[PDB]
């Protein structure tokens with residue numbers, strides 16, 4: 001039986017949390033229909049049994065059954081791909097890095113207390129780049145259908161949308177038609193609904209960092 005340890009909601013240890021790296025792994029298992037047991041970890045009060053298997057406190061960690069817990073959502077989703085090849089979620093190498101700078105540009109903008117430091121323009125630039133790729137190779141990152149790159153980016157765009165809307169009243173411009181089509185499609189997938197954090201918990205996860 002496959003098991004995964006993921007972040008719990010801040011202040012709510014029995015509730016699924018908002019780690020986008022955790023969600024990437026959960027989405028992968030859900031989309032590949034792999035049965036798994038989810039273990040919720042309060043990352044501000046990690047249980048000792050967990051530190052024994054993840055001594056650096058890394059979350060998520062994945063146990064494919066083969067008697068070992070592995071970290072790093074990149075590595076984990078590759079291991080899952082190898083163990084459960086169908087449906088294939090392989091993203092072509094040429095598209096692997098589509099949207100790679102979006103999350104970091106988002107977190108900088110989110111935490112920016114200077115409305116004119118160019119952190120917004122940076123984010124738009126990356127969003128613009130994503131909009132161009134989907135315009136040419138939509139609807140997903142590999143046209144159709146869904147692949148690993150989508151399951152990595154979707155959780156991050158969810159953070160961007162919810163957090164920027166809440167903390168800065170900022171929205172992805174309507175002009176970016178393909179991106180809006182993209183997030184609408186991805187966020188409404190059964191797997192995404194099942195594995196996403198309630199928005200209040202995502203907001204709670206970011207609030208201390210904003211302040």
Ligand SMILES: O=C1O[C@H]([C@@H](O)CO)C(O)=C1O
Pocket residue numbers: 007018019020159202204205206
């Ligand atoms: O990047 C992340 O988004 C959430 C949020 O809670 C910020 O801490 C978190 O746990 C991640 O590591």
